[PDB]
Amino acid sequence: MRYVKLPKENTYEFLERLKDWGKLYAPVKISDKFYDFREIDDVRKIEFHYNRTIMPPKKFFFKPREKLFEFDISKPEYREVIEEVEPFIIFGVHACDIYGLKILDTVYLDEFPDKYYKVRREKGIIIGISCMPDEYCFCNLRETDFADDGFDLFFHELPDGWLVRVGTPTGHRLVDKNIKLFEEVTDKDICAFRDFEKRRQQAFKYHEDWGNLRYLLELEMEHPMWDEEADKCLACGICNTTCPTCRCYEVQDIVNLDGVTGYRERRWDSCQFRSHGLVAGGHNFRPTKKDRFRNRYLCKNAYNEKLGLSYCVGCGRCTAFCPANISFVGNLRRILGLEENKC
Amino acid sequence: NDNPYALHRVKVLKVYSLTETEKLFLFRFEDPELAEKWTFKPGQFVQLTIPGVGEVPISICSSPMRKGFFELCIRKAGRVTTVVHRLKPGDTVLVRGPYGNGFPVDEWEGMDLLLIAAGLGTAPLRSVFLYAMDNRWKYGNITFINTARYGKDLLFYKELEAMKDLAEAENVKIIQSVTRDPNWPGLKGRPQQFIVEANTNPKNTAVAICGPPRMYKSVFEALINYGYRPENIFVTLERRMKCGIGKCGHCNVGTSTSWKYICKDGPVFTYFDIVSTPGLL
Amino acid sequence: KVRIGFYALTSCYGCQLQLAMMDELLQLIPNAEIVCWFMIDRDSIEDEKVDIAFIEGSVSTEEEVELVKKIRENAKIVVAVGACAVQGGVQSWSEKPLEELWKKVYGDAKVKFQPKKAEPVSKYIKVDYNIYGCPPEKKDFLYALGTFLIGSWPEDIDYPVCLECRLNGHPCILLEKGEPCLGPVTRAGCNARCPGFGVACIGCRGAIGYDVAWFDSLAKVFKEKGMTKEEIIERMKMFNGHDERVEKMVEKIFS
Amino acid sequence: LPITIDHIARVEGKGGVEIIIGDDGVKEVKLNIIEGPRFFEAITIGKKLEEALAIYPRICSFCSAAHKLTALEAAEKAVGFVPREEIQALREVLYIGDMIESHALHLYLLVLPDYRGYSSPLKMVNEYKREIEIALKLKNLGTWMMDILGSRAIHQENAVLGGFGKLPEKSVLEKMKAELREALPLAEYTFELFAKLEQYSEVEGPITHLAVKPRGDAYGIYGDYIKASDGEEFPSEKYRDYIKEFVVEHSFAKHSHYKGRPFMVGAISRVINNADLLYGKAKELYEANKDLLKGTNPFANNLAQALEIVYFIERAIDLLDEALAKWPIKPRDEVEIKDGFGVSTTEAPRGILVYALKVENGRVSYADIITPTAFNLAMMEEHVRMMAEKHYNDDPERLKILAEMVVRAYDPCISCSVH
Numbered sequence A: 001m002r003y004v005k006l007p008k009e010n011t012y013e014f015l016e017r018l019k020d021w022g023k024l025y026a027p028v029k030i031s032d033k034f035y036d037f038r039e040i041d042d043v044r045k046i047e048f049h050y051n052r053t054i055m056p057p058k059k060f061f062f063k064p065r066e067k068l069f070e071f072d073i074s075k076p077e078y079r080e081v082i083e084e085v086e087p088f089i090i091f092g093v094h095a096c097d098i099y100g101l102k103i104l105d106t107v108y109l110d111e112f113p114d115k116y117y118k119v120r121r122e123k124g125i126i127i128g129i130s131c132m133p134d135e136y137c138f139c140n141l142r143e144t145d146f147a148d149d150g151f152d153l154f155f156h157e158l159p160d161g162w163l164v165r166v167g168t169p170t171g172h173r174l175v176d177k178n179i180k181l182f183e184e185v186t187d188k189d190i191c192a193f194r195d196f197e198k199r200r201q202q203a204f205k206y207h208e209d210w211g212n213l214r215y216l217l218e219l220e221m222e223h224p225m226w227d228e229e230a231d232k233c234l235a236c237g238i239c240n241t242t243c244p245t246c247r248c249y250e251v252q253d254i255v256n257l258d259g260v261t262g263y264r265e266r267r268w269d270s271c272q273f274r275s276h277g278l279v280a281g282g283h284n285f286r287p288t289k290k291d292r293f294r295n296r297y298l299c300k301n302a303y304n305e306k307l308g309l310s311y312c313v314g315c316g317r318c319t320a321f322c323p324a325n326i327s328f329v330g331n332l333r334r335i336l337g338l339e340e341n342k343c
Numbered sequence B: 001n002d003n004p005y006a007l008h009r010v011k012v013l014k015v016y017s018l019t020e021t022e023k024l025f026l027f028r029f030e031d032p033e034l035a036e037k038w039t040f041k042p043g044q045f046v047q048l049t050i051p052g053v054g055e056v057p058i059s060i061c062s063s064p065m066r067k068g069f070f071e072l073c074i075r076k077a078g079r080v081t082t083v084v085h086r087l088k089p090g091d092t093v094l095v096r097g098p099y100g101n102g103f104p105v106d107e108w109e110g111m112d113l114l115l116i117a118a119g120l121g122t123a124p125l126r127s128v129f130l131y132a133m134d135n136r137w138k139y140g141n142i143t144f145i146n147t148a149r150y151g152k153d154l155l156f157y158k159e160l161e162a163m164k165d166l167a168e169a170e171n172v173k174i175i176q177s178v179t180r181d182p183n184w185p186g187l188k189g190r191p192q193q194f195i196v197e198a199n200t201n202p203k204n205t206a207v208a209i210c211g212p213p214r215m216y217k218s219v220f221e222a223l224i225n226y227g228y229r230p231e232n233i234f235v236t237l238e239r240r241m242k243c244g245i246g247k248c249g250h251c252n253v254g255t256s257t258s259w260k261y262i263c264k265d266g267p268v269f270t271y272f273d274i275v276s277t278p279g280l281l
Numbered sequence C: 001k002v003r004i005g006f007y008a009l010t011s012c013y014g015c016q017l018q019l020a021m022m023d024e025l026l027q028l029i030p031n032a033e034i035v036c037w038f039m040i041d042r043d044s045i046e047d048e049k050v051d052i053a054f055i056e057g058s059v060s061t062e063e064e065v066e067l068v069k070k071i072r073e074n075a076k077i078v079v080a081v082g083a084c085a086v087q088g089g090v091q092s093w094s095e096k097p098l099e100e101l102w103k104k105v106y107g108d109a110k111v112k113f114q115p116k117k118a119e120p121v122s123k124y125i126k127v128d129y130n131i132y133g134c135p136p137e138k139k140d141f142l143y144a145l146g147t148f149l150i151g152s153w154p155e156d157i158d159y160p161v162c163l164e165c166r167l168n169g170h171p172c173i174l175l176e177k178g179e180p181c182l183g184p185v186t187r188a189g190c191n192a193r194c195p196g197f198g199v200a201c202i203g204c205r206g207a208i209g210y211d212v213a214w215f216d217s218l219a220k221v222f223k224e225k226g227m228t229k230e231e232i233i234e235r236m237k238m239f240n241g242h243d244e245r246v247e248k249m250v251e252k253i254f255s
Numbered sequence D: 001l002p003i004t005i006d007h008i009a010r011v012e013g014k015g016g017v018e019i020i021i022g023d024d025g026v027k028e029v030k031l032n033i034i035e036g037p038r039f040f041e042a043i044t045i046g047k048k049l050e051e052a053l054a055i056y057p058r059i060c061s062f063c064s065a066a067h068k069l070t071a072l073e074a075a076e077k078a079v080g081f082v083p084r085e086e087i088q089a090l091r092e093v094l095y096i097g098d099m100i101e102s103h104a105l106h107l108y109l110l111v112l113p114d115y116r117g118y119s120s121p122l123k124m125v126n127e128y129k130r131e132i133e134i135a136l137k138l139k140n141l142g143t144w145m146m147d148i149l150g151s152r153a154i155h156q157e158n159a160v161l162g163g164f165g166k167l168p169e170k171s172v173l174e175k176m177k178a179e180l181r182e183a184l185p186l187a188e189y190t191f192e193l194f195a196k197l198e199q200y201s202e203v204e205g206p207i208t209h210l211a212v213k214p215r216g217d218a219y220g221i222y223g224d225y226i227k228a229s230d231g232e233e234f235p236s237e238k239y240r241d242y243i244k245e246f247v248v249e250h251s252f253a254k255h256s257h258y259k260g261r262p263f264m265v266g267a268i269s270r271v272i273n274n275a276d277l278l279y280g281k282a283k284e285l286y287e288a289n290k291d292l293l294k295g296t297n298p299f300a301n302n303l304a305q306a307l308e309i310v311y312f313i314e315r316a317i318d319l320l321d322e323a324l325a326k327w328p329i330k331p332r333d334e335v336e337i338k339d340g341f342g343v344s345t346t347e348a349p350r351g352i353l354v355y356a357l358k359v360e361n362g363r364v365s366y367a368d369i370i371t372p373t374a375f376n377l378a379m380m381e382e383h384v385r386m387m388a389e390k391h392y393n394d395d396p397e398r399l400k401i402l403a404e405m406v407v408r409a410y411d412p413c414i415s416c417s418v419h
């Protein structure tokens, strides 16, 4: 891959020339300390250094509220409502978010390729940015700190600019078209990039191995910690609706006033809601609140053999955005015994 | 074309009122191109879609050799099922393709089969029984045990009792027993009480079980106590499904060590899979 | 054509007006016939047998009691619309006796008719399906009316307002400023109007049924922000006033 | 046997008027309101200010934004805080939009089909397509303004003390200006349609008109000093000294009197009182139609409502143009809830709405609500008696429908009368 140096006086110029290609989605301020991917109109409002987004970048490919079909009851037919989408450039995707998008690609493009997801994944440019760990981020524990594939551009921050790793095609096209604004890297910036990476690795709050969580979690399925934390839990589904790797959704039918026209709607549904695991006769396969809580923990602590990564990418959205401040990493380390160590 | 959620049109040919709380339906796709090529493995389910109501899964209970036709035994226990029950022959319904892996009938050839059905789960076992009967040459003596709990709820009781003489002629022991009907003039006892009288040789027997998982432990203990091979036991379990293509996330089973999904890792499972991950039952 | 009647109890007529503010009501006329909508129709028959009865308003009169009993006798499927008809609404917020309120408001004056303490419709007659909200969302009206016209029935919702708050992308009030937002315990369908506009939810659609309304954890997180037990109890029961579960759930966490 | 209406249609409440007759014609008129008590004056006593203030709009829904605006004015007077001029301009835009919606909905949905001979608005879906379409556009303009500003058309919740939870953008406000510009010709059409309508002369007589002095250089709903036909003027806080309230035994709603005599409030009661401050096309229309807008016929209330709709559309355009200057605008102001007292007698599309609050240590200790429906019901009884005096020997159905006509011309909000 080619390393192209972008001096800081040309970053906004490159973003303006990037807006020529298509719509730009970058993290902007929405509240006092909340970030979200909003569509860019004025480039100066983009916050380059942001902790995390309130919604993961999966909303562009796995839309939060999507109309699958519109139907007519008479002569029963379902018409798929799919619209052509121009190539959009998602600027400011963390490494953890990039791995989450890869995981959702392995979930949604496997065996049966979802058309709605594929049509939006084939026309998107992911630009990765080197994050800085705050008090919640633990992407090193789940091994999502650095990525090799999935990004067409990687903006690695430098003291005197931005180091751009192209990595993939069409990144070459963008860089070659705007090569007037770009420069060439030498050891001067390489040493600074290495020092920044060393500082980033050293700044993580947690540093321990999590090899045997998937095995030990089954031995301690009936821990009193589950009961206590579930009774502390509010069952609002925020930990899943903001999660980047939750594939679950709920399909509902809406029929108009005429009684002959309607549409089918898809939205994200969490485990905490009652009707996620319900069958006929009022039987629920995770009836109690602790049952659904443990189901979420076990499911996020599963193993994806396609790429060897656990479905949790360590973004920290679940622990940060939980109203009850239930620590995911604290609970999971207490499963290991780093907090109690009774046996 | 490439849309995985896409459906196909199918019209109900004949409705058959099976019991008070169940009904049997006959289907054939409107498109001849789909009808002449559609096929399935015994055990695979179909995402039946009523327009404007919802999508529900029903296991196919027909013989796969009969191209262009299949049967769905549906019970009215909720909203979509209540709407389905009102459907008359010569009406339209959207049906999605087969999903999941059926019973391993391809690997089964010549060995004796112990098809033990309990409650509602008779439909996949009815399908595998019809498949075995349609190719009776490549199988040994087979025992089909269908059980219920209210006496009248013996699914396909008339069809089995009509074929009872021919089954006994063809080395087939079909047994129907009730669990909570002392007054019913028939066979009383649990399915475990009747699998002890199985004609199948335990050394070369494959077993298929379906129905409520609360009797799964008892039937497993009874089968393993008689020397039946645990490597040839296969069951079917149901969870909530809304997609059938592995993206809904509702049908999640197992633990962190083995987090299976039924639409892709079933619904036909294995004995060591059942005992390996607690919580499947 | 389905025979539809809208019977008005003591209410602000917000539910009927919202049903009138939607332009899709013009398409309901071809597909169904209205027997009792007095605010819209003059020739309405007030005692005709109907199929679906949309009851609006709370029960605060003996005349309303006999009216809702007549409705139950003359209707197949009875639909309670709005918080007033589902859980008593804001008309049942005060726990003081009816005589105390009468002395406070009207003093010693006497009227020919007989008043009554405000109660939900579920206390007198068996309601089948609900359309939650205050006023119910036009989405809910469309959904319930269309599902009834098809021949099926809408399902009870168990997801909180936080679902639409997190889908739409509105910032969380509770995690940011700690205001008393009743999101995690009140059913969705309003598309997070209040947290979208920056005001805390006030239980606009009522508490989640099927015993999946965990008031204890929400009371705990309100207490961690500094609210007193009485303040939290008063913040709840604004629209959930006649719910016997809330007091026990809060006193459990404040035991 | 007395003549009674079981349920009056197209009126914001359930119940009807009772007419008793004898050898001397009609003897007495008894308005029966079987609408149950709601105790909105007492259910918020001792409760927190923010919780109580949000549920006050639930008295009715035709103009609940009027209730929210009046309550916010009372609360900010009790705390003694005055919002910025742009905040007051935005609240005026909200009030104008909701008044547009309420007046247009009344004039078109309720009273218009009765004049053209229709029991329900669904009857005229095809035979009166143009008028009902213009009605839908005006109501939808009001509703969209409510959804933009107050976040909802019915039971508004965006309005908060000190400002708003989240203001819309500049393009949304410019689209609001363009929509008002487009809808002004439809307001002219509405005024012409109601001006070419007849008025019944069987009830004409002397009427006492009540209004308030507008708080500005022109006509406006905001006001402090209540004005009357006889020129009496008193501050907003002195409403109890002049207007007296009492309870009758034939209705759950309260009764009011002025100088020992019933008084009528409404759009006419404000136009014929203080229309000299009017401006715009409505001023020319009023000058042209001053002969029809006499302070004698109660049926001129509909014409006055249409004229005020046009005038307030012009005022909304002017106010939005003024408010576009103060940009960018802070969302809301935050003030500590200090102990105090305050009232608010801001005008309503039906008349003068009186709100009184007394908050102690952040909790509403005392609260009284008086509504324009209770204000004009007293003279509604007099008018129905006068009009039944001319038709007591006629067909019962015809006198019933004429009483319906006069009561809907009074434009009542029954569930506002019972708080």
Ligand SMILES: Cc1cc2nc3c(=O)[nH]c(=O)nc-3n(C[C@H](O)[C@H](O)[C@H](O)COP(=O)(O)OP(=O)(O)OC[C@H]3O[C@@H](n4cnc5c(N)ncnc54)[C@H](O)[C@@H]3O)c2cc1C
Binding pocket: A278, A279, A280, A281, B045, B054, B055, B056, B057, B058, B059, B060, B073, B074, B075, B077, B078, B079, B080, B081, B082, B120, B123, B124, B237, B238, B239, B240, B241, B242, B267
């Ligand atoms: C793999 C599989 C095979 C099945 N085979 C048969 C069969 O051969 N015969 C038969 O009569 N029934 C069968 N069922 C059960 C049948 O799918 C349910 O009875 C039906 O989905 C009930 O839907 P409902 O809308 O009426 O219930 P509701 O509770 O009103 O709806 C809940 C929704 O959950 C989903 N769902 C998925 N699985 C189930 C389930 N087991 N129970 C309830 N809801 C479920 C559906 O989308 C359903 O609409 C099978 C289920 C599964 C999972």
Ligand code: NFU
Binding pocket: D012, D059, D060, D061, D062, D063, D064, D066, D067, D102, D348, D350, D353, D371, D372, D373, D412, D413, D414, D415, D416, D417
């Ligand atoms: N006051 C008052 Fe009313 Ni019945 C309200 N809201 C006027 O429409």
Ligand code: SF4
Binding pocket: A051, A052, A094, A095, A096, A097, A131, A132, A133, A134, A137, A138, A139, A140, A144, A145, A314, A315, A316
């Ligand atoms: S967890 Fe790592 S990759 Fe994710 S946002 Fe934090 S620093 Fe970036």
Ligand code: SF4
Binding pocket: A232, A233, A234, A235, A236, A237, A238, A239, A240, A272, A318, A321, A322, A323, A324, A325, A326
């Ligand atoms: S965000 Fe926290 S309180 Fe809400 S469901 Fe998840 S764990 Fe429970």
Ligand code: SF4
Binding pocket: A240, A243, A245, A246, A247, A248, A269, A270, A271, A295, A296, A297, A299, A300, B249, B252
């Ligand atoms: S944690 Fe829950 S919502 Fe997320 S993927 Fe697993 S089952 Fe689905």
Ligand code: SF4
Binding pocket: A239, A242, A243, A244, A245, A300, A311, A312, A313, A314, A315, A316, A317, A318, A319, A328
């Ligand atoms: S479980 Fe929590 S930390 Fe892991 S991916 Fe989901 S939101 Fe992020």
Ligand code: SF4
Binding pocket: C011, C012, C013, C014, C015, C057, C081, C082, C083, C084, C085, C089, C090, C133, C134, C135, C136, D058, D061, D154, D155
């Ligand atoms: S439910 Fe809400 S909108 Fe409907 S009448 Fe009651 S308070 Fe008004």
Ligand code: SF4
Binding pocket: C161, C162, C165, C166, C171, C172, C173, C174, C175, C181, C182, C183, C184, C192, C195, C201
């Ligand atoms: S602001 Fe309220 S509704 Fe929105 S997520 Fe937070 S608690 Fe839930």
Ligand code: SF4
Binding pocket: C134, C161, C186, C187, C190, C191, C192, C193, C194, C195, C200, C201, C202, C203, C204, C205, D157
């Ligand atoms: S957010 Fe709460 S208060 Fe606001 S409309 Fe929705 S349910 Fe009602």
Ligand code: FES
Binding pocket: B241, B242, B243, B244, B245, B246, B247, B248, B249, B250, B251, B252, B261, B262, B263, B264
């Ligand atoms: S069938 Fe949908 S996720 Fe398994």
